[model samples]
Target chain A: LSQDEIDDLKDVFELFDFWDGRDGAVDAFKLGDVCRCLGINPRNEDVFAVGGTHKMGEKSLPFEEFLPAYEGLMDCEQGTFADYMEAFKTFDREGQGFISGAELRHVLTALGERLSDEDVDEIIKLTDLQEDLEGNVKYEDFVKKVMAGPYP
Target chain B: LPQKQIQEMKEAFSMIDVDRDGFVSKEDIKAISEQLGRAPDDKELTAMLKEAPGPLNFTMFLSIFSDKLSGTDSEETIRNAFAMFDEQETKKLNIEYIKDLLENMGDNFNKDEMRMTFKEAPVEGGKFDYVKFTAMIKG
Candidate 1:
């Protein structure tokens, strides 16, 4: 990140900077939130890697330490959205555009986090997936929306 | 009364009505004084309760806080008072953290009072958006 970008992220870091009064530092637990606020998401492991030493709201780090932690968290790569495309293609049994809404539900509910019927319906609606007359959808767009959000 | 003044005065009253008795009295004043470390002296405490004609309820507290000010001071006074405790400097607060203060700082807001108050506010990811909270109460 550029100096401007780091400075931009500093606003939120300072917002949760509860300890700046006692000393110039931000609460370490706030690092994750600071990242999320900037539209970048980090995993628990990444947060633990840098913030493991300081306590939740009690102990903290100065901007010097926060920048390094921010740098480390920025490298938290969860791989790309493409990794799951193969996983989805396996379910494209018909080899058509997208799968049947029912078939998509089967795959979604059959896996980890096993989404509920209501949630599955919400996901269908989320993609604004125009269904075929036979009621199939384009999972490519659906997956993209689910993973990275709307097209930029 | 502007709707904004209602909750500001309401919370100010709630903070002072240490016993949750609906009406504030000399005892509540003294209790708050004792707990807050630099509580008003007995003379000042007595003066506070004496300002009102009858049992000092929310209405009376609002009048005392409002009638004496330019009408807007009470709202901002209460806000600055709350801000005094905002260690995060985030213009917001943590639910448990602030509730703990409300439960201890000249405190009162037992379980239900705190819950009811927060039900009207936003607590996303454990952070209480108090600026929006102030704006929401204003409406």
Candidate 2:
């Protein structure tokens, strides 16, 4: 990394370190937010991966640990909105711009990120969503919602 | 069922009876499933085991197999039923075509269900020998 980029990261680090009142230790859960501050967003799966698996919810990650986590997110290859569009469209089947609730739930847990059932539910709950009586979601709208702010 | 018939059935059940304990358990079903290059749904396997009156030993399986067949279709009936799908008298057909038949045919065997059934099937050069397939379905 360039010297100035590393310099800026420290500054961005402190901004989200506000979770612990800036004693220079950020709650591990907020590590993604720190990534967000540096203009690199880490989704929940990425956060869980770099923030020590199951330890994030319970630990405070100091900058020493947070540095590597930040770098990991920056280096990670993530999917684009169009890439996700192709994926969801396979389940969209009839291409009427929606996917069944069961399919959406199945894909989140079945595919790459392999988001947990609870995370799937959380993402559903947080997205501005509506379902027809049969429980199909408007998938395009749903995907963009998740893109704008990744669930954690 | 006769003891002679029972022995044949037991030998055939050995294909899915990976446990070697003379019982066809869900684990065996799962093993057969994974053996076919796919996985089984616990829901489907759980439902399958419920079709039996008791834990599936040879006798239990005989009853269930009978229940499945007609409650009985003679092995000849099984063969003739599949032969219609053969299109040619050659007793060989495209495996993918046969796969489409089962997945959409009637009650709908899902893709994984077809894979599990076809796990021990005799398919060569992508052609399915339903005559041989029928023989395996019997036991």
Candidate 3:
């Protein structure tokens, strides 16, 4: 995000008193409140399930935890390389730098960019390492190649 | 003001007056500016507060913004608005006020774009010619 965008976010966060009485953290409920104020439907599945994770019960997220997800929602199509890395981390659930092709498909669908089987196969062919016995694609290499092209 | 414009101004004012004190003060402006990583200096802060007497109440705040929003015969209104923030009254606007105004009004001009705008203007001594600045923004 640019300085102005960051400033705008900070202004809104402060206006909503998101940090009030809480050691600089906002809970899920309060997060929803901020979203609603910004004309976003907090009840919407996409908004509620941001950060690639669902908040179960009174989950609290500090500024560092919340800013990326907020910026993703605010400017979904203009993601930075770091944003891409974070998304890759989401799909690499096993803590490995690689993810299964199946996991990739699932992540794409979840992000509302569902691809055909052929498209997925093409991507795998383009990015997957042949030596991987488990048929897992390297997440970092995949993102680097994809981002080298036009962004979504 | 039209009801829709009034409504929009009210909403914007609410965001600025975070404390719900029915007024936006120099302290409020400083706090928000600092949070964004561009804390205004004493001069800049004074220029912003000069838009109204200290602690700008809701009604006066709404009128100034609504005039700008309506975009009709508000040259005098706009001039005064600009002058308030141009404390030196040299008819040259400070970059800080311009940035703060745009931010407060919810306009999204990035730093690069803002710099380009200033470069395009008839600026001298780190100040923008208010007339040209207004024309640039209006155009």
Candidate 4:
């Protein structure tokens, strides 16, 4: 990296580090985990799971989902099975056995993110490796991607 | 119920989507540079995406869904997840393997401290539990 880029990165990294240092009530979600997912620090102390009232319905998510999903979004390998299952469940959205673009967008918005239509399509494409001719992404396909992917 | 699982599933999907659009492209991963701290070089990003696995097999798929719906952390399920990286069938993880895994994941780590972290980690019957794992991270 150029000197300028290096300097810029330090500033950016510090911004993320500072963001992570703030406590929950202010940050709302687990900012540290989010920072780790973004790669500021591959190993960070943040816990990404939404605790207390933020927990999922009757069935809470497994630990694997957060790391693997973060890795997948980073275009990396799938993490552990428990984490992957969490990611796959998230894709189900409606529990309808398929993840529609609209459903995906809604989820992203809730996570303090905004995805474009093309971006959503790309995610579906990645999640749905074999769309058959109809271009549909089955729940099984999404799960498979989450469970197993090349790590390195 | 399945409906609740689906609702939670959607919540997770949205975070990775980032753009609020339905599709996530190779570029989307690249754009996530901000979220990841340092944007990976194009070559590194491409390599990582290319390494992504294809659609999961039927058995694996069902197992995933079942785990989500039930929220049970089955030992078998957890083993399978960690097994993905514990190549050579050896439960113990060496520094080299860990480094390669991080590179594949698109995160460059500190080689020296990383090895120390892993070596000092507590291993019970060849498995690293959450406590040990967290300690390594803190190190």
Highest lDDT: give the candidate number.
2
Off by over 4 Å in 3: A1-152, B67-139
lDDT of 4 by residue, A3-103 (tens): 56445434444444343331112232433344343443322222333321233232322223333434333432325656745665766646866665445
lDDT of 3 by residue, B1-139 (tens): 4687578778878877767788887777776677678888988888867876445888878766655657454656666777887776788777666766653333445678767765676767877677766666664
Q: Say which prediction, candidate 1 or candidate 4, comes out ahead on TM-score.
A: 1
Fnat (0 to 1) per candidate: 0.00, 0.00, 0.00, 0.00
Two-chain DockQ for model 3: 0.02
Two-chain complex of model 2, DockQ on C-alpha atoms against the true structure = 0.00
Put down candidate 3 lDDT per residue, A1-152, tens digits, no spaces: 68876666666666544333324555555665665455443334455667433453457566676677676566434456898888788656588788886677777655564556776667667654343677677778777876664334
Q: What is candidate 1's lDDT per residue for B7-27, written digit by digit as tens?
A: 677887888889999988778
Which residue pairs show backbone clashes in model 1? none
Residue A87 displacement (Å), model 1: 3.1
lDDT of 4 at B58: 31
Best by the TM-score measure: 1
Please identify which of the two predictions, 2 or 4, would achieve the higher lDDT against the true structure: 2
Candidate 3 Cα deviation (angstroms), residue B61: 0.4
Query: For every candidate, what is the interface RMSD in angstroms?
Result: 9.4, 27.6, 10.2, 9.8
TM-score of each: 0.43, 0.39, 0.25, 0.21
DockQ in order: 0.05, 0.00, 0.02, 0.01
- DockQ ranking of the models: 1, 3, 4, 2
What is the lDDT for B46 in model 2? 90
Q: What TM-score would candidate 3 get against the native?
A: 0.25
Candidate that beats the other on lDDT, 1 or 2, i.e. the better one: 2
